[PDB]
């Protein structure tokens, strides 16, 4: 039995990645506007079937057919994740003063669950973070 500590998978169709600028830690609304902007860029630009591997420490995109890693991101590098219906947006890089982001857009009936799960990942890894080095 595999769990969030082990890593669990979900089927997704990789649409394409995009990039944008963001502030250190923008609001949830701007975050959603950024994710939204991502989808838009993807639509008005239009495939690969993949297995998303979510872990309390990694987010990997596997080529469903060949299981070869197309993307492998350390959980600390992802700032935001969002579900817009059947869509999933993975966003990779008070608060970190950085700007340029790399957005990965996927299409999945499991958008809600994937985002739920990666959200849980953020949860354990963050508590683990505080808990580890004092706070």
């Amino acid at each position: 039995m595999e769990d969030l500590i082990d890593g669990i998978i979900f089927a997704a169709n990789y649409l394409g990645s995009t990039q944008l600028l963001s502030d250190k830690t923008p609001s949830k609304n701007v975050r959603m506007m950024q994710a939204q902007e991502a989808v838009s860029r993807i639509k008005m630009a239009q495939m690969t079937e993949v297995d998303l591997f979510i872990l309390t420490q990694r987010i990997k995109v596997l080529n469903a057919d060949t299981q070869e890693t197309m993307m492998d991101h350390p959980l600390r590098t992802i700032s935001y994740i969002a579900d817009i219906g059947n869509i999933v947006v993975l966003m990779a890089r008070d608060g970190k003063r950085q700007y340029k982001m790399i957005c990965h857009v996927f299409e999945s009936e499991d958008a809600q669950l994937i985002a739920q799960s990666i959200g849980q990942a953020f949860s354990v890894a963050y508590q683990e973070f505080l808990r580890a080095n004092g706070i």
Binding site: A82, R93, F129
Partner: peptide, 12 residues
């Protein structure tokens, strides 16, 4: 329409 911010990210 939901989003999740990675808190730990903030410190990196």
């Amino acid at each position: 329409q939901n989003g999740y911010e990675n808190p730990t990210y903030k410190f990196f």
